[PDB]
Design a protein around this ligand. Structure first.
Ligand SMILES: CC(C)OC(=O)c1cc(NC(=S)OC(C)C)ccc1Cl
Lengths: 539, 414
């Protein structure tokens, strides 16, 4: 019992040839099991007895699984696959729960051995040949080949799903008010019809599949809502996040702390308040995964605090196309941002936080900007729309930053919401030199090879200074020159430098950097009431 | 019939992933593609075809009708060469040019059956709830290079009559476009253009001023009194500027900068310095010598954000040896959108690039990859798409070009 569905044209690599790997020798017991199952498949029409004509071969194996402890079968296509042509990417992007709509009812049909339901491209079939070993390599063993999509073979997934699309094409057009979703061997059919109508249609769909050889479940194997869709429990009316379990032990190995921090981080998305700082700390200097690191009181505490938070089930709402899409963002500390997308207050579709982007040199606004873009991109994918933005930054700050920044940047339609901490400009270099204020002509010089240097300034008012540095770079010195300059200067300063990097700060005015040095400078920068930076060519 | 097109020796078909699209855009693509599917232009394809090319919808300049666009860039680059038309040097010297979209004419022609697979494109589904809609071309695809190429005979053919009727006009064909340059006054020009469209319409198809651009040297600031700073800024600018005109000197000025003075302190100009200045003003009065376009070299266009909606660009092939420098101010409507100005700008330069040399320059864009990719498509309007890289603007380069001369009053449009 196979199918009347026209095959897909499968070709080799380019110019390679089918696998010719030797058949792993098995035991009388393992052989006999494979003999049994293969005879079955031979009659169901899935495979075919072949002969000496076929040179290609793939090793067959025999394992006993849990469900029946009954001997089963497995075929290693690793080779065949690495020789099989590339197909188009299978749907690697799956729907995110916040993007689905609520359905009056939702059913999951499990198209079981769907792979073995679709015919194999008759030409290619020879390449799927394998052999059942004889009792310790006796006379010739039993030879076969697949006539249907093989479990484990490269094309099987892409091919099967395609088939499903054609096959469902009619039904779909015939009833636009029904919505099917294919994934693996599962068809998820949801709708807004009254339960009986729905149930009915399900049956039609099934029987329709039957019209093509596609067998469907059994009451015993029938799946039921809620559905486990990676981390979430969906119910046709709303979704709920699976309560995640943290073990309590008196012995935590490195793996234990890592895997933990993993599940922890994952949760940080949804659950507000998760922290792993003290748990990550335990990793410092670990010499082995199997290493046991004692939880400091610090860690034992946060681990505790988290257990409390995770005991609250976060419940969610689905996407309703007839209402606004809104996204609010908070600056949860420097570099970290939290966001939550909803249409109706406190009824969230999705939430998440973006990790502290540790990098060369930036500012909040740019970092906000990026968060906004990350969000928009995600939004476009989930809902084919961008959310109206609610941002903790005055439009006055935005208009001031963007309109002058050296790089093109943008934020879609948005609106300010005063939910501190508000992001702002930590400082602003003067547009023109300051009248009255002191003028530090700064300079730093270091022998890059000895790593020795000096740095200092001379002001127009007489003040001067130098400082010798051991284990430094010329860049640092130029920068330290500027640090000391700001350290000794009053509330308003004029500073001149030949540092190319100082030019970078004039253009970008970063409020965070990878180098503590630059940071310090930023600190001083923020401290002054007025600072004028001016660069001049060297020498 | 179909001409046997192939790929460059040892090249494979694009396998570029489809970027996500807004719903409206997906809706239109669907409407649009079913129609073409019906008209026999494109066909659904199987999974055995692993190639792919980006697609998207752009707003046909005026109407609400959405235009289907594909990014054949990767295909074009992999498509064998036809060893197009030689650039008509006269185009640049015309008073008013007009651009027209003759991409439509391509559907009429069949694409070699063997090349079709390589044209596979895809319409994505929101939240990935539906598999993508895989197609491919049976006809000449719009935006592909081989298209205006294979359709050359028929093109020249259909054109001749208008060319002889009005031989004072020049017609250039780039990809899906047609630029028409004549010296006729606006009314007489556009009427003649329409007279052309009518001519083009009886088959199946469907305001520049080249003589007004490319110049503007670098003017230096002039002041009643100069300060330690004014000068310092000025010296850094000229010092960088020496990479272009080595005759520019700053030594005399640098002497005036001898001393640890207050930035705001006024300095008196020594005649010696004043001469050095004037001498530099003269050197800047005109573009550098020896700059000649080389067709075998990639053309390049670097843009810089000057703020307040203003921008600067330099088309060149060799660093500092610029073929053209210019400025772009934002267009009415783009007031709070950087990508709009940028996309619009890229287009203009790319059009001038075509008009003047018959190719597209590669762009060094003062933007972040993610910002570009996320929103450029939204403001695009050309059938073609230039190449680009995202770069960090060296602060001086900007400072320099910010010095370009601007009109006295402007191009008076009474
Ligand atoms: C993630 C999948 C497996 O879960 C469902 O099938 C599912 C889908 C929906 N909503 C929609 S629009 O349905 C889609 C099929 C469009 C609502 C509840 C559930 Cl449980």
């Amino acid at each position: 019992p196979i199918s009347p569905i026209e095959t897909v044209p499968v070709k080799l690599k380019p110019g390679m040839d089918g696998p010719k790997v030797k058949q792993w020798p098995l035991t009388e017991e393992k052989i006999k099991a494979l003999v049994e199952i293969c005879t079955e498949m031979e009659k169901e029409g899935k495979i075919s007895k072949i002969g000496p004509e076929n040179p290609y071969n793939t090793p067959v194996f025999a394992i006993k699984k849990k469900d029946s402890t009954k001997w089963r079968k497995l075929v290693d296509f690793r080779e065949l696959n690495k020789r099989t042509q590339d197909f188009w990417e299978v749907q690697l992007g799956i729907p995110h729960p916040a993007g689905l709509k609520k359905k009056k009812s939702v059913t999951v049909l499990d198209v079981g051995d769907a792979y073995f339901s679709v015919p194999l491209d008759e030409d290619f079939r020879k390449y799927t040949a394998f052999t059942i070993p004889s009792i310790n390599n006796e006379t010739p063993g039993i030879r076969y080949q697949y006539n249907v999509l093989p479990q484990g073979w490269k094309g099987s997934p892409a091919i099967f799903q395609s088939s499903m699309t054609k096959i469902l094409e009619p039904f779909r057009k015939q009833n636009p008010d029904i919505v099917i979703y294919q994934y693996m061997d599962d068809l998820y059919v949801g709708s807004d019809l009254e339960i009986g109508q729905h149930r009915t249609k399900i049956e039609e769909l099934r029987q329709h599949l039957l019209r093509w050889g596609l067998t469907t479940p059994d009451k015993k194997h029938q799946k039921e809502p809620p559905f486990l869709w990676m981390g979430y429990e969906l119910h046709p009316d709303k979704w709920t996040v699976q309560p995640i379990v943290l073990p309590e032990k008196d012995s935590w190995t490195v793996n234990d702390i890592q895997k933990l921090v993993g599940k922890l981080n994952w949760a940080s998305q949804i659950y507000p308040g998760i922290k792993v700082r003290q748990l990550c700390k335990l990793l410092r200097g670990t010499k082995a995964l199997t290493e046991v690191i004692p939880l400091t009181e610090e860690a034992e505490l946060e681990l505790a605090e988290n257990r409390e938070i995770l005991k609250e089930p976060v419940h969610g709402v689905y996407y309703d196309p007839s209402k606004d899409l809104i996204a609010e963002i908070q600056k949860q500390g420097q570099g970290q941002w939290t966001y939550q997308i909803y249409q109706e207050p406190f009824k969230n579709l999705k939430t998440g936080k973006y990790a502290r982007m540790r990098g060369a040199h930036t500012n909040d606004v740019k970092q906000l900007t990026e968060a906004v873009q990350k969000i928009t991109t995600e939004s476009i994918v989930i809902w084919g729309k961008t959310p109206k933005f609610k941002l903790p930054i005055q439009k006055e700050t935005w208009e001031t930053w963007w309109t002058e920044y050296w790089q093109a940047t943008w934020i879609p339609e948005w609106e300010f919401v005063n939910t501190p901490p508000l992001v702002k400009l930590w400082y602003q270099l003067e547009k023109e030199p300051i009248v009255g204020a002191e003028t530090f002509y700064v300079d730093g010089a270091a022998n890059r090879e000895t790593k020795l240097g000096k740095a200092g300034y001379v002001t127009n008012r007489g003040r001067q200074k130098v400082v010798t540095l051991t284990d430094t770079t010329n860049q640092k010195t130029e920068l330290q020159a500027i640090y000391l300059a700001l350290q000794d200067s009053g509330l308003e300063v004029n500073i001149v430098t030949d540092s190319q990097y100082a030019l970078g700060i004039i253009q970008a005015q970063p409020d965070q950097s990878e180098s503590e040095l630059v940071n310090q400078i930023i600190e001083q920068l923020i401290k002054k009431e007025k600072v004028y930076l001016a660069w001049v060519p060297a020498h | 019939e179909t001409v046997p097109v192939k790929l460059k020796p040892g090249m494979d078909g694009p396998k570029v992933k489809q970027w996500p699209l807004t719903e409206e855009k997906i809706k239109a693509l669907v409407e649009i593609c079913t129609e073409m599917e019906k008209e026999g232009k494109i066909s659904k394809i199987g999974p055995e075809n692993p190639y792919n090319t980006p697609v998207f919808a752009i707003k046909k300049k005026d109407s609400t009708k959405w235009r289907k666009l594909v990014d054949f860039r990767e295909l074009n680059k992999r498509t064998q060469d036809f060893w197009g038309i030689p650039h008509p040097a006269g185009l640049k010297k015309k008073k008013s040019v007009t651009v027209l979209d003759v991409g439509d004419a391509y559907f009429s022609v069949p694409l070699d059956e063997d090349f079709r697979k390589y044209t596979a494109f895809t319409i994505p589904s929101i939240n990935n709830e539906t598999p993508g809609i895989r197609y491919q071309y049976n006809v000449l695809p719009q935006g592909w290079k081989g298209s205006p190429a294979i359709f050359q005979s028929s093109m020249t053919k259909i054109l001749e009559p208008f060319r002889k009727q009005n031989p004072d006009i020049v017609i250039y064909q780039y990809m899906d476009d047609l630029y028409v340059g004549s010296d006729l006054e606006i009314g007489q020009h556009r009427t003649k253009i329409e007279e052309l469209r009518q001519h083009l319409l009886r088959w199946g198809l469907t305001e520049l001023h080249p003589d007004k651009w490319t110049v503007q040297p670098i003017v230096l600031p002039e002041k009643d009194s100069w300060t330690v700073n004014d000068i310092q800024k000025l010296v850094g600018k000229l010092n960088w500027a020496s990479q272009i005109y080595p005759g520019i000197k700053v030594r005399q000025l640098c002497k005036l900068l001898r001393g640890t003075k207050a930035l705001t302190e006024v300095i008196p100009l020594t005649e010696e310095a004043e001469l050095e200045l004037a001498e530099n003003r003269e050197i800047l009065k005109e573009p550098v010598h020896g700059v000649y376009y080389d067709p075998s070299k990639d053309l390049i266009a670097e843009i810089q954000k000057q703020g307040q909606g203003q921008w600067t660009y330099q088309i060149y092939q060799e660093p500092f040896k610029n073929l053209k420098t210019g400025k772009y101010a934002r267009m009415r409507g783009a007031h709070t959108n950087d990508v709009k100005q940028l996309t619009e700008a890229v287009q203009k330069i790319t059009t001038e690039s075509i008009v003047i040399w018959g190719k597209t320059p590669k762009f060094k864009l003062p933007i972040q990859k993610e910002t570009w990719e996320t929103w450029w498509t939204e403001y695009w309007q050309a059938t073609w798409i230039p190449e680009w890289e995202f770069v960090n603007t060296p602060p001086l380069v900007k400072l320099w070009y910010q010095l370009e001369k601007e009109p006295i009053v402007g191009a008076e449009t009474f």
